[PDB]
Amino acid sequence: ASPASIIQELASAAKQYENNESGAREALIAQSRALIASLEVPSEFIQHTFWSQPALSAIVRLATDVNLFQYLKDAQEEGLNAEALASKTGMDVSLFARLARHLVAMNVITSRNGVFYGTALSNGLAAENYQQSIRFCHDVSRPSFGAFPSFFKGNGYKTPALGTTDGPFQSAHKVDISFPQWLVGNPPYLQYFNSYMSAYRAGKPNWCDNGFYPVADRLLNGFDASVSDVLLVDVGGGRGHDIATFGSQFSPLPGRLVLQDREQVINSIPADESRQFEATTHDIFTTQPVKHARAYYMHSVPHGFGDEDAVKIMANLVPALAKGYSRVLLNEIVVDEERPVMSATNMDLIMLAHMGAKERTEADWRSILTRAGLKVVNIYSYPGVAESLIEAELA
Amino acid sequence: ASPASIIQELASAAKQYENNESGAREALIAQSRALIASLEVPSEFIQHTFWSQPALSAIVRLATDVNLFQYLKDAQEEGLNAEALASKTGMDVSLFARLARHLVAMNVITSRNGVFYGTALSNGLAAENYQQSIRFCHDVSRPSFGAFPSFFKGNGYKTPALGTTDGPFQSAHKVDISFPQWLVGNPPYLQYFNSYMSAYRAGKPNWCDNGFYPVADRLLNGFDASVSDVLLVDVGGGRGHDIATFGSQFSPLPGRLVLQDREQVINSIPADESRQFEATTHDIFTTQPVKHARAYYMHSVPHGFGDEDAVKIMANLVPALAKGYSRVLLNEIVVDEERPVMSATNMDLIMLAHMGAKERTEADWRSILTRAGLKVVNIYSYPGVAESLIEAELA
Numbered sequence: 001a002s003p004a005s006i007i008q009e010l011a012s013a014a015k016q017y018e019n020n021e022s023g024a025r026e027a028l029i030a031q032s033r034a035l036i037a038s039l040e041v042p043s044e045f046i047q048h049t050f051w052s053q054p055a056l057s058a059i060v061r062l063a064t065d066v067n068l069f070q071y072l073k074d075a076q077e078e079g080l081n082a083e084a085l086a087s088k089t090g091m092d093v094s095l096f097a098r099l100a101r102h103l104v105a106m107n108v109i110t111s112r113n114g115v116f117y118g119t120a121l122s123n124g125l126a127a128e129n130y131q132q133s134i135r136f137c138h139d140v141s142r143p144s145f146g147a148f149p150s151f152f153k154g155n156g157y158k159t160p161a162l163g164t165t166d167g168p169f170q171s172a173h174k175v176d177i178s179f180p181q182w183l184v185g186n187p188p189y190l191q192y193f194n195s196y197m198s199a200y201r202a203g204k205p206n207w208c209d210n211g212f213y214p215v216a217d218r219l220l221n222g223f224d225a226s227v228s229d230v231l232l233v234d235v236g237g238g239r240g241h242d243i244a245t246f247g248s249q250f251s252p253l254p255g256r257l258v259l260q261d262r263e264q265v266i267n268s269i270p271a272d273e274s275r276q277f278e279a280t281t282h283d284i285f286t287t288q289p290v291k292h293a294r295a296y297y298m299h300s301v302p303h304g305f306g307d308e309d310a311v312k313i314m315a316n317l318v319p320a321l322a323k324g325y326s327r328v329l330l331n332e333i334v335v336d337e338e339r340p341v342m343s344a345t346n347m348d349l350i351m352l353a354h355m356g357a358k359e360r361t362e363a364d365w366r367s368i369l370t371r372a373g374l375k376v377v378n379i380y381s382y383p384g385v386a387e388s389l390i391e392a393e394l395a
Numbered sequence: 396a397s398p399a400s401i402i403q404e405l406a407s408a409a410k411q412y413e414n415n416e417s418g419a420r421e422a423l424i425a426q427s428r429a430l431i432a433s434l435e436v437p438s439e440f441i442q443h444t445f446w447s448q449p450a451l452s453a454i455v456r457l458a459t460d461v462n463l464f465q466y467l468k469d470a471q472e473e474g475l476n477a478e479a480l481a482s483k484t485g486m487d488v489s490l491f492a493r494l495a496r497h498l499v500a501m502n503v504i505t506s507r508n509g510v511f512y513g514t515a516l517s518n519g520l521a522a523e524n525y526q527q528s529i530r531f532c533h534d535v536s537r538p539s540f541g542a543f544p545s546f547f548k549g550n551g552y553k554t555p556a557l558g559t560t561d562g563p564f565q566s567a568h569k570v571d572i573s574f575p576q577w578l579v580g581n582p583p584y585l586q587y588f589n590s591y592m593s594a595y596r597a598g599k600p601n602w603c604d605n606g607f608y609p610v611a612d613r614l615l616n617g618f619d620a621s622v623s624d625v626l627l628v629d630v631g632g633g634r635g636h637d638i639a640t641f642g643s644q645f646s647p648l649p650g651r652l653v654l655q656d657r658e659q660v661i662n663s664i665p666a667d668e669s670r671q672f673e674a675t676t677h678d679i680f681t682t683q684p685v686k687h688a689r690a691y692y693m694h695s696v697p698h699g700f701g702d703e704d705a706v707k708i709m710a711n712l713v714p715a716l717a718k719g720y721s722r723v724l725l726n727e728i729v730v731d732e733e734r735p736v737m738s739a740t741n742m743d744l745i746m747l748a749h750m751g752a753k754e755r756t757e758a759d760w761r762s763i764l765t766r767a768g769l770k771v772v773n774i775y776s777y778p779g780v781a782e783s784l785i786e787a788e789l790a
């Protein structure tokens with residue numbers, strides 16, 4: 001694809017974005033990235049990859065220490081010059097200006113006549129769940145990626161055997177314990193991860209949104225309280241962000257919403273009397289205790305585990321499924337390995353960097369499900385979103 | 396700015412690029428990066444900044460250990476599938492494909508029907524000087540940026556006072572010596588750096604190219620061998636790539652070209668009977684030994700030093716200058732703090748993370764030059780080129 005060819009494909013993607021077609025925003029972004037690569041000389045690729053981006057990561061991390069994005073949000077259309085922001089942040093003015101000027105250059109904040117102004121991005125990054133995501137990513141994930149070359153040279157360029165305890169995460173952070181055990185042993189990073197989970201794919205269509213999975217036809221239609229008064233269980237749902245969205249979309253609810261996660265996660269949920277779900281403790285490596293519910297939902301859970309654990313996780317739902325009633329809803333990335341895209345590779349490498357795990361093709365998922373005693377009904381996807389929704393049933 | 400307005404500017408700069416207008420390639424990349432910023436939601440920014448790019452850096456680093464880009468260059472348009480490259484690189488084929496698919500998604504290589512192919516980018520990165528740049532950047536510069544949050548938290552968010560010994564480089568690499576001393580004390584990174592200086596801005600218009608600095612009218616016109624038989628001294632020219640480029644564009648040369656650097660750099664230059672310059676050792680903090688030359692040229696040298704040192708560097712040329720004849724040519728970034736651009740913020744932060752130094756405005760440079768006993772004749776710039784060309788003369 002020549003630059004002239006990409007310029008045309010970008011202009012055609014822009015028209016579809018203007019027509020508000022699904023995924024056209026994401027397609028317009030990917031055409032813009034392909035155009036950059038077709039134009040940059042190798043020296044510019046070196047400067048962007050190893051100068052601009054590591055410095056951006058460092059400054060954005062430093063932003064969470066000094067309240068930078070919160071000050072620019074509160075300053076609104078007025079903004080703040082370098083002297084003002086240096087005074088609020090407690091920073092040397094020349095230091096601040098130099099760092100903020102990289103943010104301007106990287107399109108994270110804007111400047112005009114010496115004044116700095118928030119963006120929708122920087123205003124969005126001021127929220128506490130993004131603050132804690134930035135901290136987790138820079139303090140925890142970044143060193144694991146930095147250790148890929150030495151670790152894989154040291155292990156013979158082998159895929160980590162057990163995944164849980166012989167990967168780049170353990171070498172970077174100088175431990176011989178698994179990443180979940182590391183989380184529990186290294187506060188505040190368990191809590192940052194719990195906040196992070198409400199942010200890693202936010203602002204994208206949800207599995208249950210309109211045009212994606214037909215929730216109303218498959219779940220609400222035919223829901224039967226004589227079989228079970230539970231409508232949906234979110235197995236591994238974290239603090240509940242996902243099940244909370246579902247409840248808001250499909251109210252009045254005909255049955256209960258049950259959140260399941262580990263006790264340390266469940267205890268972290270802020271008390272709210274408007275809550276529509278019941279926050280419960282359940283370990284996915286034991287048999288599912290809620291019986292015959294209309295739907296059992298997982299999002300970004302078995303993708304962190306090897307084949308045997310992924311088969312157990314799914315098989316532990318089987319004893320609770322009511323034949324001809326209970327849906328198994330697996331909300332996970334399905335790798336199309338003939339068409340690689342960044343949404344899948346990002347998560348696959350994040351899975352390698354933390355859990356020594358991997359993302360899966362439709363064939364791999366079909367195999368884990370069949371071994372678990374389940375079979376696929378249908379797979380649903382939506383343009384622009386990373387994950388698919390695999391509906392499964394008792395084999 | 397609005398996406399629909401960036402869409403038009405991108406299309407406008409596309410027309411300018413297809414007319415081969417100066418800097419239009421660089422403006423199209425900039426408009427492409429601006430559109431992506433206007434479209435990406437914060438969660439996508441998080442995944443790109445904190446997953447895609449650190450993963451990209453490490454895979455490009457790992458590529459230099461297993462001869463990847465070279466194998467893809469050898470394969471030319473035939474390419475290699477995952478099993479073949481895994482065999483050649485000595486990696487598990489599953490691990491290789493996962494890492495190679497991120498290079499595909501990030502536009503570093505391409506894929507069709509399970510075959511991977513090199514690009515102009517990956518083919519260019521196979522060259523040794525880029526291989527060593529990659530090694531330097533991921534091993535040496537990467538941890539320096541990674542220590543920015545903790546270092547400036549600890550030092551009070553202050554500019555490094557001395558710069559050389561009190562910076563994030565010393566904090567990241569657990570030393571209290573200067574970066575130049577660290578280089579000498581940590582082979583092979585000195586020589587990696589020396590190769591790196593032929594790559595960090597390669598493929599961009601040089602100061603002496605057509606439409607930039609008028610070398611012929613200012614230097615060749617009026618060259619007077621009765622004053623001196625030396626046409627140009629490159630003060631701090633590394634292994635001589637810049638002075639070699641100059642000699643080839645302006646042959647047959649009317650006078651001598653003299654390179655000056657540290658002996659540990661000069662004695663790393665491959666012996667070459669076709670070379671057009673004389674390779675000499677000279678310390679920029681001693682008086683310039685070559686007397687009355689037509690030009691004394693500096694590229695990316697005093698930007699690495701504080702004000703007092705940079706004055707000495709420029710001042711040490713003054714005793715050698717022939718009044719009304721000798722030109723001083725300083726080829727450095729001139730920061731426009733009314734217009735932040737990646738080309739200057741990149742190298743400014745690079746200067747901070749290695750030398751504790753900074754890039755300078757036109758006011759800063761004029762003040763240093765005046766203190767050195769010099770005055771500015773003119774300042775030359777070129778669309779899309781990071782550096783300017785400041786011509787100075789005896790005050």
Ligand SMILES: CC(C)=CCC/C(C)=C/CC/C(C)=C/Cc1c(O)c(C)c2c(c1O)C(=O)OC2
Pocket residue numbers: 141179180181183184193200262263264265300301302303304305350351354355
């Ligand atoms: C409370 C306790 C007993 C132990 C800790 C339990 C725990 C949090 C375990 C981790 C389980 C797991 C599948 C993690 C796998 C996982 C993701 O899925 C997602 C989306 C992300 C990351 C990740 O590691 C990540 O770094 O960025 C997003």
Ligand SMILES: CC(C)=CCC/C(C)=C/CC/C(C)=C/Cc1c(O)c(C)c2c(c1O)C(=O)OC2
Pocket residue numbers: 536574575576578579585588592595657658659660695696697698699700745746749750
């Ligand atoms: C051999 C010896 C005795 C001493 C070592 C002398 C030495 C190499 C000192 C370094 C001097 C100096 C101004 C360095 C400043 C400098 C750059 O300019 C450029 C373009 C780059 C970097 C950099 O640090 C960098 O990291 O990426 C490109």
Ligand SMILES: Nc1ncnc2c1ncn2[C@@H]1O[C@H](CSCC[C@H](N)C(=O)O)[C@@H](O)[C@H]1O
Pocket residue numbers: 180197198235236237238239241242260261262265282283284285298299300301
């Ligand atoms: N053994 C276990 N039992 C129950 N939950 C577990 C578990 N191991 C990991 N988890 C949970 O699985 C989740 C994976 S991250 C996914 C969170 C949420 N489903 C979302 O997509 O936003 C985490 O919340 C983690 O606490």
Ligand SMILES: Nc1ncnc2c1ncn2[C@@H]1O[C@H](CSCC[C@H](N)C(=O)O)[C@@H](O)[C@H]1O
Pocket residue numbers: 592593630631632633634637655656657660677678679680693694695696
């Ligand atoms: N004290 C000193 N005396 C002479 N050269 C020095 C020096 N300190 C640093 N240098 C040289 O200054 C150069 C800075 S990097 C710039 C290299 C080259 N001018 C280019 O633009 O590509 C290095 O080659 C380094 O060896």
